[PDB]
Amino acid sequence: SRPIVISGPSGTGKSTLLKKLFAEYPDSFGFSVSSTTRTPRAGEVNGKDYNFVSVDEFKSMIKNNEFIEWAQFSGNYYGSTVASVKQVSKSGKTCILDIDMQGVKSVKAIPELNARFLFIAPPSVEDLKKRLEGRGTETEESINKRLSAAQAELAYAETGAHDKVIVNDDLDKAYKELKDFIFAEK
Numbered sequence: 001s002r003p004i005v006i007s008g009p010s011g012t013g014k015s016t017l018l019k020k021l022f023a024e025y026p027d028s029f030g031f032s033v034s035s036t037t038r039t040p041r042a043g044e045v046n047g048k049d050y051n052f053v054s055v056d057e058f059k060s061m062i063k064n065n066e067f068i069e070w071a072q073f074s075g076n077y078y079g080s081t082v083a084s085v086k087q088v089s090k091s092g093k094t095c096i097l098d099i100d101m102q103g104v105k106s107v108k109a110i111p112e113l114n115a116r117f118l119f120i121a122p123p124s125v126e127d128l129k130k131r132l133e134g135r136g137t138e139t140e141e142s143i144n145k146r147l148s149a150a151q152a153e154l155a156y157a158e159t160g161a162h163d164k165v166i167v168n169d170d171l172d173k174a175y176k177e178l179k180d181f182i183f184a185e186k
């Protein structure tokens with residue numbers, strides 16, 4: 001039951017690594033489903049990817065102390081709840097939290113959770129830029145901000161804040177590392 005917090009910039013293939021994990025070990029791990037006020041994307045199931053809540057409900061959740069941690073990103077709110085983590089743990093599975101660097105810093109400050117920290121790094125920031133540009137979705141201005149956030153995360157990883165850093169420069173290789181880390185148990 002030590003929760004594993006996984007973080008890393010989007011574009012690293014991080015969702016595919018976890019997709020594989022939950023495919024191979026469906027009865028061993030439970031995902032912490034965060035609440036968010038952003039709008040759902042095609043493919044996302046409310047209650048599975050996120051619990052999509054209004055701003056009035058997310059404010060009520062803040063005032064009633066329902067979060068382990070919460071942040072804002074691009075004007076929308078996101079947070080991990082006490083009740084989603086508690087339900088996975090009482091099911092008897094290992095809780096996995098997929099959160100950003102602000103979320104990592106916050107859970108670091110909660111000794112009680114006793115979490116493990118795994119960071120999934122891009123091959124390099126230049127490579128991340130190529131993937132984000134190759135998607136065609138982002139603008140010059142959002143990509144620049146994402147690269148600046150990924151540089152801040154890599155500098156924070158060199159303080160020794162995570163228990164393990166995986167460089168995802170090949171999915172199957174990073175997936176073998178991820179399972180080696182996890183099933184080591186501590």
Ligand SMILES: Nc1nc2c(ncn2[C@@H]2O[C@H](COP(=O)(O)O)[C@@H](O)[C@H]2O)c(=O)[nH]1
Pocket residue numbers: 010034035038069070071073078079080098099100102103104
């Ligand atoms: N701190 C924190 N960050 C989160 C949480 N859920 C998702 N994030 C993040 O906020 C960003 C946006 O996620 P997206 O909108 O793509 O699903 C990503 O950096 C992702 O890691 C949460 O519960 N807490």
